């Protein structure tokens, strides 16, 4: 990755260099669909339902 | 028992054998010599109402809510509508099977 935030001078003044991570970000996504329903079904148990 | 064609009837159930206002009520219909036939449910909070395809507003169901009674409200009489009509619990609050059946009140239409 290279050296570009003269770490030697951060360091003197209380900032150590940490660990160096990737950047990754979302993209081209996979659509499916899927049903929800929001209602039981109380057929067998239809008595109760009042 | 009587009435006349285009007339107006009112009937109640007979059951008596508990709180009517806990349980599944339907209205039963059964022309003589003929099968049974449902006309209108009952909720039991006494808002929603279940109906037939055929009845299409002729018939309404209420509740006295004092007295314990559920009514049955009839108008534009035909010598169709001359049957029994068997006010039936349904065993539970809900939709579900009779268990037990009124005895039912004789509907005469004629002349």
């Known amino acids: 990755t290279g050296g570009i935030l003269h770490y030697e001078k951060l360091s003197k003044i209380g900032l150590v260099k940490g660990v160096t991570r990737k950047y990754k970000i979302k993209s081209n996504p996979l659509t499916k669909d899927i049903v929800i329903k929001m209602i039981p079904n109380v057929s067998n148990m239809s008595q109760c339902t009042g | 028992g009587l009435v006349k064609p285009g007339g107006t009837l009112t009937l109640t159930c007979k059951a008596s054998?508990?709180?009517?206002?806990?349980?599944?009520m339907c209205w039963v219909r059964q022309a003589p010599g003929k099968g049974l036939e449902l006309i209108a449910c009952?909720?039991?909070?006494?808002?929603?109402?279940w109906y037939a395809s055929w009845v299409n507003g002729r018939f309404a169901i209420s509740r006295s809510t004092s007295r314990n009674t559920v009514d049955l409200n009839m108008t534009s009489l035909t010598a169709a509508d001359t049957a029994t009509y068997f006010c039936?619990?349904?065993?539970?609050?809900?939709?579900?099977?009779?268990?037990?059946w009124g005895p039912g009140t004789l509907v005469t239409v004629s002349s």
């Open positions: 039936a619990r349904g065993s539970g609050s809900g939709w579900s099977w009779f268990n037990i």
């Open positions: 054998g508990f709180t009517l206002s806990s349980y599944w």
């Open positions: 009952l909720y039991t909070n006494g808002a929603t109402t």
